[PDB]
Amino acid sequence: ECIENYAKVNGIYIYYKLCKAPEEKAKLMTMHGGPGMSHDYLLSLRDMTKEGITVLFYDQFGCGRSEEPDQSKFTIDYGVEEAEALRSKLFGNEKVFLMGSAYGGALALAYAVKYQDHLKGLIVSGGLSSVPLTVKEMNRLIDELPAKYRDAIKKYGSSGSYENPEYQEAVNYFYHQHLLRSEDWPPEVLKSLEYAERRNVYRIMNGPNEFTITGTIKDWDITDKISAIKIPTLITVGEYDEVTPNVARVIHEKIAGSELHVFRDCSHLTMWEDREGYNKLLSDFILKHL
Ligand SMILES: N[C@@H](Cc1ccccc1)C(=O)CCl
């Protein structure tokens, strides 16, 4: 049982769940994806507490159980300041390892660019430094889909008929192929998905679904800045990840000494497709960089 509480950061109440000890060797801040999902689907990383890794989960502004600020603050830059503020008034000056998943990865990168001096290492899983490049790669994945689903996406997607039954069918197919290659999805993942739909962050910042980024972050691209990251960096990406290894690669080319690990038979949520392998890899990376 981890410690759960509300923390008032930039004027709002942000929910966080801290799982630590025994014999804590390091702390790990985690940034769920979306934008607009929740920490819930990242819960499998809890397996690293028995490896001496203290894991910190938290719902970003307007996500899960956290309240949302003024819509004018629905940006990655604010997410960065929120993140630092949380780290500060929870761990103080202590340096920590930051892990970001998907959008969380993007956020982690934006964070590192400005506050890498507060970190000992950075982990990006299915992350990205450029939304446009991510869009491009996803369109390719959509083209590789069977004509039926590929046509329903362009057909109903161009008219904004995201509620269409044929479209939703194409979405599920794509997800079972690039989001989670499993038939029996865990409650944690499903809860993050439900949170995305029920709140307003995903809709505004991201868009309708995973591969339809019509949100306010559609032009975001810090590929040029991420080259300043001078800390141990681990980059993981699923073989069939919706955020392709091509996107992962671009981040790998930018961060010197960074490592890239492409999980076989895995897609986006590699923490559930290969839970042990994923946690083992992160555990080893963290433990060899104290
Ligand atoms: N929707 C994914 C990845 C993504 C983010 C932002 C734009 C496009 C794609 C994430 O953030 C959820 Cl796990």
33 close to ligand 1 (CB < 6 Angstrom): yes
Residue of minimum CA distance from atom 12 in ligand 1 = 34
Looking at the CA of residue 242, tell me the nearest atom of ligand 1: 3
Identify the residue whose tokens are 């340096």.
95
Pair 214, 207: CB distance under 8 Å: yes
Q: How many CB atoms lie within 10 A of CB 230?
A: 12
Q: How far is the CA of 35 from the centre of ligand 1 (A)?
A: 6
Pairing of strands 53-58, 13-19: antiparallel
| Cα–Cα dist 13/16, whole Å | 10
Residues 6+ apart with CB under 8 A from 269: 41, 126, 179, 180, 189, 238
| Cα–Cα dist 286/158, whole Å | 44
Looking at the CA of residue 101, tell me the nearest atom of ligand 1: 13
Residues 6+ apart with CB under 8 A from 277: 263, 270
Residue of minimum CA distance from atom 6 in ligand 1 = 103
210 close to ligand 1 (CB < 6 Angstrom): yes
Pair 234, 285: CB distance under 8 Å: yes
131 close to ligand 1 (CB < 6 Angstrom): yes
CATH of span 1-290? 3.40.50.1820
Q: How far is the CA of 211 from the centre of ligand 1 (A)?
A: 8
Method: X-ray
> Can you list the pairs that 137-145 forms with residues at least 24 positions away whose Cβ atoms lie under 8 Å?
137/243, 137/244, 137/246, 137/247, 138/210, 138/211, 138/242, 138/243, 138/244, 139/211, 140/244, 141/174, 141/178, 141/211, 141/242, 141/244, 142/174, 142/211, 145/170, 145/173, 145/174, 145/177
In angstroms, the Cα distances linking 71 to 74, 200, 220, 271 are: 5, 9, 17, 31
Q: How many CB atoms lie within 10 A of CB 264?
A: 10
Q: How far is the CA of 66 from the centre of ligand 1 (A)?
A: 19
